[PDB]
């Protein structure tokens, strides 16, 4: 039949995919250090012989919202949030390094510093931070310097042991990977530490998802979705009527 | 009246193409820069500003454009179909083809280089400039041209379109064919 049936179907299909991207945003409102995902549609025309009447649209992710997340003051010593722009460099389960903004850190039984996702926290030597096992008081600095008190030591024996690797690259050069870690679009790009990134210890950075912004985008995808499915029915209606040209 | 900075913003797309179709603008500010393509079709604009820069292609089909001043930079093509241009200035940096179909064009710059196709279809031009170089297809159909210069260069096909050519260039290397 007419190709407008599939031209509208290819549009309704993308609206559902855009709806899925907004659904993931609202599910992650309470998530810690979550960067909102933007949804956009690209107009692609079928170039060739004939009148230029058919143009497809596909939904794609143009970028992410890198605005500062909501800061939650918790009073916990091992809670860190990046003041302004900046990232925390961590290595995932496989070992590939990446940037994260979740500062819900913790100390394991061996002293290795991890975050809430389990990623190991990189240090001054581009290696995971391993603090002494018998600690007494962890006091993270504003610049990322970790000053710990050995167990049984006097309060005046406060010494720095490591400095968290904070990286502030261009946000437009970062893409979210398959596990929520932002990495460079260009492969084999070294993550260079920055001396301007600051860590506000004792607070946790929340999500930056604008709940109303997603809701008002939802009510427009539904209407656009319903208009296209009416086009599918009216293209079906036209073909059924034209079935009476072979009756003879 | 004339286009302002705020009026410019209301005729620009996401990638930076200025659309002035049917808009009542008479003159553009000097030193004008366009991020992408420029469209001044059907406009009462009779003159393009000096120092004009277009990051894309200039579209002036069926417009009132008459004068383009030298120094204009156009990255894409120039489409002046149906406009009121009578002469082409010297020193225009054109990154694409030049379509001058159905224009009152009479004179062309000497040793003009067209990086794309050239059209003089149905134009009152009497003779082509010496040393003309065309990297694409040349359409002279329906024009008043009947004598080619001593030397010319066309890297594509040459379409006569109906006009009769009597004096062919002495030095001519053609990458394509000649069609009547």
């Amino acid at each position: 039949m007419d190709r407008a049936l599939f031209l509208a179907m290819s549009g309704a299909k993308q609206n559902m995919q855009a709806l899925q991207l907004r659904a993931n945003n609202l599910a992650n409102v309470s998530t810690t250090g979550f960067r909102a995902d933007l949804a956009q549609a690209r107009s692609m025309q079928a170039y060739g012989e004939g009148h230029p009447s058919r143009v497809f649209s596909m939904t794609e992710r143009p970028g992410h919202n890198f605005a500062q997340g909501s800061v939650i003051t918790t009073g916990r010593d091992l809670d860190v949030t990046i003041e302004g722009s900046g990232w925390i460099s961590v290595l995932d389960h496989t070992g590939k390094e990446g940037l994260t903004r979740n500062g819900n850190l913790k100390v394991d039984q061996n002293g290795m510093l991890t975050n809430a996702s389990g990623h190991l926290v990189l240090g001054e030597n581009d290696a995971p931070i391993t603090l002494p096992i018998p600690l007494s008081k962890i006091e993270i600095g504003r610049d990322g310097t970790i000053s710990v008190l050995p167990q049984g030591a006097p309060a005046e024996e406060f010494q720095a042991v490591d400095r968290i690797k904070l990286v502030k690259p261009n946000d437009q050069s970062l893409f979210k990977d398959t596990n929520g870690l932002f990495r460079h679009k260009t492969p084999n790009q070294p993550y260079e530490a920055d001396a301007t990134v600051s860590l506000q210890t004792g607070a946790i950075e929340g999500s930056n998802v604008n709940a109303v912004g997603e809701m008002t985008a939802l009510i427009d995808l539904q209407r656009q979705f319903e208009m296209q499915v009416k086009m599918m029915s009216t293209a079906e209606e036209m073909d059924k009527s034209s079935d009476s040209l072979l009756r003879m | 009246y004339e286009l302002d900075y705020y009026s410019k913003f209301g005729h620009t797309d996401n990638y930076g193409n200025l659309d002035l179709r049917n808009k009542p603008y008479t003159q553009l500010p000097s030193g004008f820069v366009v991020k992408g393509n420029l469209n001044i079709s059907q406009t009462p604009i009779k003159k393009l500003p000096k120092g004009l820069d277009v990051g894309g292609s200039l579209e002036a089909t069926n417009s009132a454009l008459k004068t383009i001043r030298s120094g204009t930079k156009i990255k894409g093509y120039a489409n002046l179909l149906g406009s009121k241009i009578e002469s082409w200035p010297r020193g225009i940096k054109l990154g694409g083809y030049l379509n001058l179909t159905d224009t009152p064009l009479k004179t062309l710059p000497a040793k003009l280089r067209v990086k794309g196709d050239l059209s003089v279809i149905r134009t009152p031009i009497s003779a082509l400039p010496e040393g003309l170089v065309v990297d694409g297809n040349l359409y002279i159909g329906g024009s008043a041209l009947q004598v080619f210069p001593d030397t010319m260069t066309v890297k594509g096909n040459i379409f006569l379109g109906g006009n009769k050519i009597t004096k062919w260039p002495s030095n001519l290397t053609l990458g394509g064919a000649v069609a009547p």
Binding site: Q45, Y47, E49, G50 | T61, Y97, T101, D117, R122
Partner: peptide, 24 residues
């Protein structure tokens, strides 16, 4: 001819004049 602002279905090339449209 007819309409003055018809489109062209050929992909942009910026070097070849589109002959799909009635370029007169």
């Amino acid at each position: 001819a007819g309409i003055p602002g018809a489109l062209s279905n050929q992909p942009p090339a910026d070097a070849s004049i589109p002959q799909d449209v009635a370029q007169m």
